[PDB]
Enzyme design. Structure first.
Site, PDB file in Angstrom:
ATOM      1  N   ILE B  25      -8.973  -6.636  -8.359  1.00 31.18           N
ATOM      2  CA  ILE B  25     -10.354  -6.148  -8.440  1.00 31.18           C
ATOM      3  C   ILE B  25     -10.479  -4.819  -9.190  1.00 31.18           C
ATOM      4  CG2 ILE B  25     -11.159  -7.543  -6.453  1.00 31.18           C
ATOM      5  CD1 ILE B  25     -11.256  -4.740  -4.912  1.00 31.18           C
ATOM      6  N   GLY B  26      -9.351  -4.184  -9.459  1.00 35.04           N
ATOM      7  CA  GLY B  26      -9.356  -2.954 -10.193  1.00 35.04           C
ATOM      8  C   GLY B  26      -7.956  -2.440 -10.383  1.00 35.04           C
ATOM      9  N   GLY B  28      -5.653   1.162 -12.415  1.00 38.90           N
ATOM     10  CA  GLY B  28      -5.593   2.447 -13.077  1.00 38.90           C
ATOM     11  C   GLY B  28      -4.303   3.160 -12.705  1.00 38.90           C
ATOM     12  N   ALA B  29      -4.417   4.476 -12.519  1.00 41.30           N
ATOM     13  CA  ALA B  29      -3.271   5.373 -12.474  1.00 41.30           C
ATOM     14  C   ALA B  29      -2.789   5.546 -11.047  1.00 41.30           C
ATOM     15  CB  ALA B  29      -3.637   6.729 -13.081  1.00 41.30           C
ATOM     16  N   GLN B  30      -3.738   5.505 -10.113  1.00 41.22           N
ATOM     17  CA  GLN B  30      -3.441   5.467  -8.691  1.00 41.22           C
ATOM     18  C   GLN B  30      -2.565   4.251  -8.323  1.00 41.22           C
ATOM     19  OE1 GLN B  30      -6.188   3.576 -10.442  1.00 41.22           O
ATOM     20  NE2 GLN B  30      -6.407   2.645  -8.371  1.00 41.22           N
ATOM     21  N   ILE B  32      -2.490  -0.559  -8.657  1.00 42.83           N
ATOM     22  CA  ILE B  32      -3.298  -1.773  -8.731  1.00 42.83           C
ATOM     23  C   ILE B  32      -3.792  -2.332  -7.368  1.00 42.83           C
ATOM     24  CG2 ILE B  32      -1.365  -2.442 -10.405  1.00 42.83           C
ATOM     25  CD1 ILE B  32      -3.479  -5.215 -10.357  1.00 42.83           C
ATOM     26  N   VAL B  33      -5.018  -2.823  -7.386  1.00 40.74           N
ATOM     27  CA  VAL B  33      -5.769  -3.154  -6.195  1.00 40.74           C
ATOM     28  C   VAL B  33      -6.245  -4.604  -6.316  1.00 40.74           C
ATOM     29  CG1 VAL B  33      -7.847  -2.562  -4.729  1.00 40.74           C
ATOM     30  CG2 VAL B  33      -6.568  -0.769  -5.964  1.00 40.74           C
ATOM     31  N   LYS B  48      -3.755  -2.090  -2.133  1.00 42.03           N
ATOM     32  CA  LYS B  48      -3.427  -1.207  -3.255  1.00 42.03           C
ATOM     33  C   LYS B  48      -1.924  -1.005  -3.281  1.00 42.03           C
ATOM     34  CE  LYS B  48      -5.028   3.434  -4.629  1.00 42.03           C
ATOM     35  NZ  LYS B  48      -5.827   4.548  -3.985  1.00 42.03           N
ATOM     36  N   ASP B 144     -14.740  14.583  -7.264  1.00 42.96           N
ATOM     37  CA  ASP B 144     -14.782  13.483  -8.245  1.00 42.96           C
ATOM     38  C   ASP B 144     -15.742  12.311  -7.887  1.00 42.96           C
ATOM     39  OD1 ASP B 144     -12.264  11.337  -9.887  1.00 42.96           O
ATOM     40  OD2 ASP B 144     -14.102  12.361 -10.682  1.00 42.96           O
TER      41      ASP B 144
HETATM   42  C1  LIG Z   1      -9.371   0.361  -2.714  1.00 47.17           C
HETATM   43  C2  LIG Z   1     -10.721  -0.307  -2.496  1.00 47.17           C
HETATM   44  C3  LIG Z   1     -11.184  -0.404  -1.164  1.00 47.17           C
HETATM   45  S1  LIG Z   1     -12.773  -1.187  -1.163  1.00 47.17           S
HETATM   46  C4  LIG Z   1     -12.899  -1.461  -2.851  1.00 47.17           C
HETATM   47  N1  LIG Z   1     -13.900  -2.069  -3.554  1.00 47.17           N
HETATM   48  C5  LIG Z   1     -15.093  -2.311  -3.055  1.00 47.17           C
HETATM   49  O1  LIG Z   1     -15.312  -2.130  -1.856  1.00 47.17           O
HETATM   50  C6  LIG Z   1     -16.132  -2.786  -4.046  1.00 47.17           C
HETATM   51  N2  LIG Z   1     -15.561  -3.337  -5.308  1.00 47.17           N
HETATM   52  C7  LIG Z   1     -15.409  -2.614  -6.462  1.00 47.17           C
HETATM   53  O2  LIG Z   1     -15.714  -1.421  -6.571  1.00 47.17           O
HETATM   54  C8  LIG Z   1     -14.837  -3.263  -7.694  1.00 47.17           C
HETATM   55  C9  LIG Z   1     -15.403  -4.664  -7.879  1.00 47.17           C
HETATM   56  C10 LIG Z   1     -15.121  -5.431  -6.610  1.00 47.17           C
HETATM   57  C11 LIG Z   1     -14.742  -6.782  -6.651  1.00 47.17           C
HETATM   58  C12 LIG Z   1     -14.487  -7.480  -5.474  1.00 47.17           C
HETATM   59  C13 LIG Z   1     -14.598  -6.811  -4.262  1.00 47.17           C
HETATM   60  C14 LIG Z   1     -14.942  -5.458  -4.178  1.00 47.17           C
HETATM   61  C15 LIG Z   1     -15.202  -4.715  -5.329  1.00 47.17           C
HETATM   62  C16 LIG Z   1     -11.684  -0.909  -3.479  1.00 47.17           C
HETATM   63  C17 LIG Z   1     -11.526  -0.954  -4.966  1.00 47.17           C
HETATM   64  N3  LIG Z   1     -12.388  -1.589  -5.752  1.00 47.17           N
HETATM   65  C18 LIG Z   1     -11.950  -1.358  -7.014  1.00 47.17           C
HETATM   66  N4  LIG Z   1     -10.852  -0.593  -6.977  1.00 47.17           N
HETATM   67  N5  LIG Z   1     -10.590  -0.328  -5.626  1.00 47.17           N
END
Ligand SMILES: Cc1csc(NC(=O)CN2C(=O)CCc3ccccc32)c1-c1ncn[nH]1
EC number: 2.7.11.24
Lengths: 10, 340
Positions: B25-26, B28-30, B32-33, B48, B144
């Site tokens: 779902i995301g 970066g540098a921290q 992968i999630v 993560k 931030d």
């Molecule tokens: C660590 C973390 C804990 S909760 C969360 N994300 C969200 O709560 C919301 N969220 C995002 O914002 C990115 C797009 C997305 C797609 C599917 C599900 C959730 C999310 C993250 C995260 N999202 C993206 N990077 N990290």
């Protein structure tokens, strides 16, 4: 004091 | 207790078996999630995997801080750590660290573009502020804040992700972007950038170099007061002092009634008022968290339980401060990463 319960993420 | 592998791009996620249907779902540098189903809670969570936690001493210090910071906080408007694990069974083979957090539906990037009535706007901003205030009480100044690390659910609840901190410039306070110091209300600047953008549906202060970011600040907010510009290092000042001298556009002009749910006027002037106090270049003239929460536009939502909640611990000012070897950082982190 009654908050929203829905948010259109759609 | 037992683990399995899933690829995920060029990365391999080896996780406890209870976590299933991993998809990215995301990144970066921290690190992968992935979103994932947790079989043991019957709930979706975010995993993560920390990016090279022990590559060097700053990578290692940053991973232990993630963890000690997390276990200073416990609030409905802050993303909580649910679990942490490692597939390695002994200290000397230990490398990978996984953090498991609450999952939400989306960041605020969606929501800024839609068009909210006052209770949703006002209610999102109220939850942002209860989360920010809980961070501050724990000794955490975020620095931030922006739409991408503020996450939301279709039931209109909201959580703030990391803290801060941790391209991102648009929401950063003038004291930051001009290298002054900062305190608690540095996060207030950012709430005004989010809120102002929620009303206007565009980024308040674009650019693409800080240089151009300052331009959009002064173009809209006018040049600050001469006294404020003495506080600035001789070098930042010389630059800032010799820019064009704007009066500022004023808040009715920046945010007119035409942009709000309307009477509802009231009401828009309450929102306008708060923004006029949040978006104040000088941190010494800017609204604090408390007064923003006591403010008529936010204060409708006031609950003692959500506002006055003290943190499980105030964060150790320092250690912050304090170095260890990579063997000794491993030990401290492994300790957490199976800490029951
Ligand atoms: C660590 C973390 C804990 S909760 C969360 N994300 C969200 O709560 C919301 N969220 C995002 O914002 C990115 C797009 C997305 C797609 C599917 C599900 C959730 C999310 C993250 C995260 N999202 C993206 N990077 N990290």
């Amino acid at each position: 004091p009654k908050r929203p319960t829905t948010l259109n993420l759609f | 207790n037992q683990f399995y592998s899933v690829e995920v791009g060029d990365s391999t996620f080896t996780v406890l078996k209870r976590y299933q249907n991993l998809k990215p779902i995301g990144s970066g540098a921290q690190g992968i999630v992935c979103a994932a189903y947790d079989a043991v809670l019957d709930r979706n969570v975010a995993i993560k995997k920390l990016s090279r936690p022990f590559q060097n001493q700053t990578h290692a210090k940053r991973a232990y801080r993630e963890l000690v910071l997390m276990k200073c906080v416990n609030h409905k408007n802050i993303i909580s750590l649910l679990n942490v694990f490692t597939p390695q069974k002994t200290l000397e083979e230990f490398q990978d660290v996984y953090l498991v957090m609450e999952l939400m539906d989306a960041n605020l990037c969606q929501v800024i573009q839609m068009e909210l009535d006052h209770e949703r706007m006002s209610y999102l901003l109220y939850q942002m502020l209860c989360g920010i205030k809980h961070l501050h009480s724990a000794g955490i100044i975020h620095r931030d804040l922006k739409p991408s690390n503020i996450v939301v659910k279709s039931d209109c609840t909201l959580k703030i992700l990391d803290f801060g901190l941790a391209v991102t410039r648009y929401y950063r306070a003038p004291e930051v972007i001009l290298g002054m110091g900062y305190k608690e209300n540095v996060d207030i600047w950012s709430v005004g950038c989010i809120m102002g953008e929620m009303v206007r549906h565009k980024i308040l202060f674009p650019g693409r170099d800080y240089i151009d970011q300052w331009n959009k600040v002064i173009e809209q907010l006018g040049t600050p007061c001469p006294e404020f510009m003495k506080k600035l290092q001789p070098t930042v000042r010389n630059y800032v002092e010799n820019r064009p001298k704007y009066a500022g556009l004023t808040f009715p002009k920046l945010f007119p009634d035409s942009l709000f749910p309307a009477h509802n006027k009231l009401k828009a002037s309450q929102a306008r008022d708060l923004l006029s106090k949040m978006l104040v270049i000088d941190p010494a003239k800017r609204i604090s968290v408390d007064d923003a929460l006591q403010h008529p536009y936010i204060n409708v939502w006031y609950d003692p339980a959500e506002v006055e909640a003290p943190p499980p611990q105030i964060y150790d000012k320092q250690l912050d401060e304090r170095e260890h070897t990579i063997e000794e950082w491993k030990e401290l982190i492994y300790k957490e990463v199976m800490n029951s």
